[PDB]
Amino acid sequence: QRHSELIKHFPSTMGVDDFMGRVEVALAGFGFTGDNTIAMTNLCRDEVTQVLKDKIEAIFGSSFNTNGLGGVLTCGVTGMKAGLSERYVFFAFPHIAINSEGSCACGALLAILNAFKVDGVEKSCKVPGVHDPLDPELTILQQRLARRVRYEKLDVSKLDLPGLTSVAERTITDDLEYLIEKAVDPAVADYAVITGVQIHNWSIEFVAPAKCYTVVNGLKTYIDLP
Amino acid sequence: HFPSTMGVDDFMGRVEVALAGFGFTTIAMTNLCRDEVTQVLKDKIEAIFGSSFNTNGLGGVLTCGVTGMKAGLSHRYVFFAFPHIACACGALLAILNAFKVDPGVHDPLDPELTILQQRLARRVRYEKLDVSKLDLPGLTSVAERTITDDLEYLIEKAVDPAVADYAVITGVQIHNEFVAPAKCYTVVNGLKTYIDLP
Numbered sequence: 001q002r003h004s005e006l007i008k009h010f011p012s013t014m015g016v017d018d019f020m021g022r023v024e025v026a027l028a029g030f031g032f033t034g035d036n037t038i039a040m041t042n043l044c045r046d047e048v049t050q051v052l053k054d055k056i057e058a059i060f061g062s063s064f065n066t067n068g069l070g071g072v073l074t075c076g077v078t079g080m081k082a083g084l085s086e087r088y089v090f091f092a093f094p095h096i097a098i099n100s101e102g103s104c105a106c107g108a109l110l111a112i113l114n115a116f117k118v119d120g121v122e123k124s125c126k127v128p129g130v131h132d133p134l135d136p137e138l139t140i141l142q143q144r145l146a147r148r149v150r151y152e153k154l155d156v157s158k159l160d161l162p163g164l165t166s167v168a169e170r171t172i173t174d175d176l177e178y179l180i181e182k183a184v185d186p187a188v189a190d191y192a193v194i195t196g197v198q199i200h201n202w203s204i205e206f207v208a209p210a211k212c213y214t215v216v217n218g219l220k221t222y223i224d225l226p
Numbered sequence: 227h228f229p230s231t232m233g234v235d236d237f238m239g240r241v242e243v244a245l246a247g248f249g250f251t252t253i254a255m256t257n258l259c260r261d262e263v264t265q266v267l268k269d270k271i272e273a274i275f276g277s278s279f280n281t282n283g284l285g286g287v288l289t290c291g292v293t294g295m296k297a298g299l300s301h302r303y304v305f306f307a308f309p310h311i312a313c314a315c316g317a318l319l320a321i322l323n324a325f326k327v328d329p330g331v332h333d334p335l336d337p338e339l340t341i342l343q344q345r346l347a348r349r350v351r352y353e354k355l356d357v358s359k360l361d362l363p364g365l366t367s368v369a370e371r372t373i374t375d376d377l378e379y380l381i382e383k384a385v386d387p388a389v390a391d392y393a394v395i396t397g398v399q400i401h402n403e404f405v406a407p408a409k410c411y412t413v414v415n416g417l418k419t420y421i422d423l424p
């Protein structure tokens with residue numbers, strides 16, 4: 001009941017403010033500030049994620065938001081180009097809640113884990129391009145998650161909500177780069193990418209950074225948390 | 227093109243007075259285009275209802291699904307849906323450009339865009355429209371019909387009238403800030419009362 005960081009479920013876990021500091025430090029190093037950059041934020045649509053989006057916009061005045069269910073990126077390549085209209089910073093995060101150690105973290109990720117648990121993971125592993133019209137964002141997310149879970153050969157019997165949440169982060173990150181490739185020419189602009197897992201510790205807000213880098217002058221440099 | 231057009235704050239006056247007739251404050255779902263310029267009506271809506279959630283997609287597409295609507299409805303209910311126009315809705319103008327140059331399916335590289343694009347095609351073909359003749363305010367108005375029953379399909383999947391009052395405010399946002407309303411009703415204690423302004 002002190003630092004409330006038994007959240008080592010994600011080794012990289014930081015305070016959200018601690019987190020935001022490192023970012024603008026690392027980002028200032030590469031020429032990014034609230035001065036010259038536009039931020040795109042992508043979180044889950046749920047209201048519990050608003051604290052992270054607010055911190056980011058506190059630093060980045062020029063900002064646009066593309067939140068999808070469970071953090072899925074259904075705005076696509078047009079949704080992205082719409083917002084960027086020379087220095088861009090993309091933040092993408094799924095999100096999880098942990099008491100100490102346990103209204104619903106991520107609603108989508110909860111239902112999905114169950115889906116993978118009761119039915120197969122195989123039931124959801126569809127060809128990309130397909131969705132249930134009754135639940136477009138959710139099912140697009142299931143499937144991408146399913147493909148990803150199969151892609152790094154994961155023992156589903158041993159998959160828990162943190163593990164799933166961490167597959168979502170690798171997934172949402174990968175999708176982000178696929179849009180970024182279509183929508184951003186590293187010859188024309190410099191940009192950055194910050195991804196990770198948002199963690200609601202109900203009261204303290206944490207963030208576990210995952211993949212971070214800058215593409216400056218057509219040259220990519222990775223950034224770890226310290 | 228939009229004979230229903232009003233100023234946006236007049237609208238938000240008639241709307242809240244109308245709604246006040248049965249309900250007032252109530253949670254609110256807002257669904258507009260992701261574009262920034264839609265924020266005018268957003269904040270005005272929130273202005274009246276502090277309990278809210280937003281479900282914006284490209285052009286106003288309701289890809290939030292039933293689960294999206296259910297997650298937001300956990301604290302009776304009132305639903306706002308509007309596409310828009312002025313670069314008006316870059317999305318509708320992109321679909322329009324398309325409709326005049328060319329089932330649970332989508333481009334992975336533009337899911338919201340192409341989902342809406344499909345739902346408009348169906349609305350276009352249903353209503354029996356000449357695409358050569360279709361222009362931007364026509365498709366916008368279509369999109370208002372598309373977005374509305376979409377919303378409606380989502381609603382009494384998500385909402386049980388025997389237990390909840392809900393309300394529906396739809397229409398078209400117009401910039402040069404105007405709102406041309408369209409389908410507006412309340413359902414209270416069971417009884418559905420459509421609303422026309424004026």
Ligand SMILES: [Zn+2]
Pocket residue numbers: 044045046069070071095105106107108
């Ligand atoms: Zn969520």
Ligand SMILES: [Zn+2]
Pocket residue numbers: 259260261284285310314315316317318
């Ligand atoms: Zn638009």
